Symmetry: C3
Subunit: 107 residues, 3 copies
């Protein structure tokens, strides 16, 4: 099986279905929340919404580039928020699940 | 790629046909007052969805796409009486599907 | 690498950034601009928008089909408009650039 297929049909599907996915399914809406510093501090934004489109529209060079985007999504969240926030536990849980599913990856 | 063939040849052929229109998007059970449709048919399918899936790198391979076309025809034959307009249209389209699927490459 | 991937991430990216891209990012709206003859003279219309959808959705059989589309876009423009017209000077700059990027295509 292709790596990128797996990332779409398996890795991403699992994370998307998951309970805590909703804040990561579209980008952080800085106006709606009142956080003018978000686009200042977070240099390269990223969300599963974006990732899903990239898989569906032939953007990624290799599976290593799609994984990059996942880590950036997580690392972004951890930078901008203080540990033990609500959002951060959510991210942490998703990254747990994410990292499980990478290890099953085709080879 | 056989998937290319299913998009560019098989699906265009079927979509362009006169009988396609009821199979180009889901059956809208609300509009038809068919509240039993979504309870009887458990995997609904249509060319709208199939098209989307080919355009968005969903399928594991050509043979999963063929499964979807079959599910489309057989859902029709499950829900509807034989000899109904809808069922004769489905049969027309399936005949034409089987012709086009024969000249499939082997990759 | 796959050449289609190159056409998406490098060629089309570069052309779409460019200052003169905007009139070529969607079909030439003959009704808006008030050109009844455009669609009689131009038998195969084309634009960077349609090429993009096509790259994003697995439409192209191979990379030479995509390259023809880019060439149709320019020639259509030279056919329909007069020399010295602005749109032609724009397309000419875009074509220049297109041809540079095409000379670093994977093989
Ligand atoms: C504000 C908030 C309250 C809450 F109880 C739970 C969450 C996840 C939450 O965070 C979000 C809620 C909605 C949205 C929308 C739909 C606008 O994209 C985003 C977030 C949010 C998402 N992500 C990925 C973040 O990194 C941060 C988000 N919220 C800003 C935030 O965490 N805070 C606002 C002020 O700083 C402390 C808490
Ligand atoms: C209702 C109907 C009348 C007709 F003269 C021809 C058709 C094809 C027809 O079927 C449909 C018409 C519209 C739509 C829309 C566009 C709303 O999705 C769907 C169908 C239809 C499509 N498919 C694939 C089906 O299996 C069944 C559909 N309609 C309900 C239907 O045919 N019946 C409902 C119960 O009575 C027996 C027949
Ligand atoms: C009309 C016009 C005036 C102008 F000052 C600069 C341009 C590029 C221009 O051309 C277009 C402007 C907008 C649009 C929109 C965005 C609506 O589709 C299209 C064009 C246009 C684009 N392309 C690719 C063409 O080949 C021709 C276009 N316009 C009609 C046109 O250029 N002419 C109309 C008849 O007179 C000679 C010039």
């Amino acid at each position: 099986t292709n790596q990128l297929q797996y990332l779409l049909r398996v890795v991403l599907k699992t994370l998307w279905k998951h309970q805590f996915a909703w804040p990561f399914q579209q980008p952080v809406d800085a106006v709606k929340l009142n956080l003018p510093d978000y686009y200042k501090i977070i240099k390269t934004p990223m969300d599963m919404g974006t990732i899903k489109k990239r898989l569906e529209n032939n953007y990624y060079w290799n599976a290593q580039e799609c994984i990059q985007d996942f880590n950036t999504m997580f690392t972004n969240c951890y930078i901008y928020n203080k540990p033990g926030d609500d959002i951060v536990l959510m991210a942490e849980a998703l990254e747990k699940l994410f990292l499980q599913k990478i290890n099953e990856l085709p080879t």
